[PDB]
Amino acid sequence: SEPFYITTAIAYPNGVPHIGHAYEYIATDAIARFKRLDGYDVRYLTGTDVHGQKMAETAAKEGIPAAELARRNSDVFQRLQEKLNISFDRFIRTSDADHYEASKAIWKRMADAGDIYLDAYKGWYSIRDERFFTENETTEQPDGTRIATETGAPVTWTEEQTYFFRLSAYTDRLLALYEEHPEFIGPDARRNEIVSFVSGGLKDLSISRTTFDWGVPVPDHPDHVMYVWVDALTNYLTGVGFPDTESESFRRYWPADLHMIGKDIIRFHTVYWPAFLMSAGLPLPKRIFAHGWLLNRGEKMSKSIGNVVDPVNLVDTFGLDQVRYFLLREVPFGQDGSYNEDAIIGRVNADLANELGNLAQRSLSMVAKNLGAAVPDPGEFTDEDTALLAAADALLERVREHFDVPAMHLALEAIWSVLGAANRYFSAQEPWVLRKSDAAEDQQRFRTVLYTTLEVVRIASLLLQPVMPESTAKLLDLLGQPTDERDFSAIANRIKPGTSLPAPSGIFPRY
Numbered sequence: 001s002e003p004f005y006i007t008t009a010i011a012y013p014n015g016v017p018h019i020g021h022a023y024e025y026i027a028t029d030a031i032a033r034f035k036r037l038d039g040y041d042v043r044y045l046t047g048t049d050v051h052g053q054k055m056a057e058t059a060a061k062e063g064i065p066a067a068e069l070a071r072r073n074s075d076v077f078q079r080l081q082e083k084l085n086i087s088f089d090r091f092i093r094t095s096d097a098d099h100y101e102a103s104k105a106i107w108k109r110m111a112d113a114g115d116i117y118l119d120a121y122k123g124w125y126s127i128r129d130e131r132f133f134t135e136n137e138t139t140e141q142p143d144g145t146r147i148a149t150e151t152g153a154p155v156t157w158t159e160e161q162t163y164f165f166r167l168s169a170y171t172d173r174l175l176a177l178y179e180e181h182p183e184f185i186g187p188d189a190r191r192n193e194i195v196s197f198v199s200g201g202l203k204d205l206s207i208s209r210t211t212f213d214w215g216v217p218v219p220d221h222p223d224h225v226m227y228v229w230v231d232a233l234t235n236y237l238t239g240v241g242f243p244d245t246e247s248e249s250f251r252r253y254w255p256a257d258l259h260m261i262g263k264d265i266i267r268f269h270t271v272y273w274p275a276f277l278m279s280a281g282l283p284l285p286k287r288i289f290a291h292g293w294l295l296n297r298g299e300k301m302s303k304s305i306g307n308v309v310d311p312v313n314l315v316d317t318f319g320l321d322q323v324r325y326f327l328l329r330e331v332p333f334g335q336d337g338s339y340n341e342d343a344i345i346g347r348v349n350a351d352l353a354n355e356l357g358n359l360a361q362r363s364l365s366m367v368a369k370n371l372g373a374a375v376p377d378p379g380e381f382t383d384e385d386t387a388l389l390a391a392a393d394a395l396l397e398r399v400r401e402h403f404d405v406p407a408m409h410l411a412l413e414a415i416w417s418v419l420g421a422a423n424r425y426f427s428a429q430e431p432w433v434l435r436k437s438d439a440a441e442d443q444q445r446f447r448t449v450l451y452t453t454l455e456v457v458r459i460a461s462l463l464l465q466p467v468m469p470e471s472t473a474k475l476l477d478l479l480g481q482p483t484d485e486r487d488f489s490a491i492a493n494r495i496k497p498g499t500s501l502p503a504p505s506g507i508f509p510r511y
């Protein structure tokens, strides 16, 4: 049972959780659930990044302490993930006591390696991005104020005696990493962008601040606070028992197998983060994957459902598993995507309610009121039965391949291809005709067709567990599958004839 450590980006709790956060949490949960069912030892970290000037300003604007905004908004972020049914092991917050020790530990490691030095910083700083920018990287507006060229965010002139990380010393050591291990950055398009960015030379990074005190204090220097990103990135270590490197959690889970992040914070994770770990003498994570953004088509406020970009609203409107499926199916993972009210409705009613819902319900109904509510004892299998079962048995292997990319959209395409095949099979065999017949060879065939249908929807249900936890559990309840037999190892064991089935009811309803 090999360990699998997966993390999400710990977002700033300065406002209301966006659709992008929910998209990330669902996507990461799907992989984390998939690995558990595939027999892995999974640690799954998520949470919030409560420090920084961005947080301190929003707290001062709302006239409350920074620590008060930290708890309140993190509680909101945590409840969203609870509503989204995220199976995280720990919801980390950078204000945690064990995180303070971990941030001070990695700092000491880097300083002892000789990568931290005191020097006066002079330059522009974006508070919205929590990011440093150079003179050329900024555009002087006709209004007078300065903005960051890339993001378009307002930048503030900063002149402080700060601590610097010798990032310029790791340029070629980072470029070798991308060449030797191309799997480090994903998708391929992101890696090439980072290669060209690092190829143009790297400048030293300021890693402490003095103008504010909302952040992790630098050891031996109370007047200095750690750069929010040095604080933020260390969470991935904290979530596995850092600074205790001898601990069971650290020796087993570190380095992380996958960092799940949005594409707007890729430089921090693929440039700064590995350089920090190289300096600290710690193993580098195996893969960082950046997903695209989800943008609304048309109007923000609907005339029937309300706010389209509100994650909580969509779950209340359409149902959790409906939203979970849509986001993972609609947009190819890694690319930017678009959605509207009709896109969700169409996908929910066609793919879930009809293609999967009705196939399951009709077959389970025929077993209930025509076959004594028990799995039919099948007869001899025909070429049609075998070919469909072969397409279903092949799923797990390719679904595993898609999930390792990660590419949840292709996995869902693969499963629906078989579900559609199961629907055409159901239409061709005509069980509703066969149940009316008096012939013994037609009655046994009716039992075989129903058994084959139940087996395909069982395999499908087992594989769809990471995507739709609640709905698939209720499907497997109706398919008489024991709770202690819902791992991917159970796919190889066919549904047992004579297994008692409870009264079937709709699980995927239309809108």
Ligand code: MET
Pocket: 008, 009, 010, 011, 012, 049, 232, 233, 234, 235, 265
């Ligand atoms: C260590 S990942 C930090 C993510 C950052 N707080 C953001 O919201 O973009």
Ligand SMILES: O=P([O-])(O)O
Pocket: 185, 186, 187, 188, 189, 334, 405, 406
């Ligand atoms: O482009 P990749 O990194 O998803 O293979």
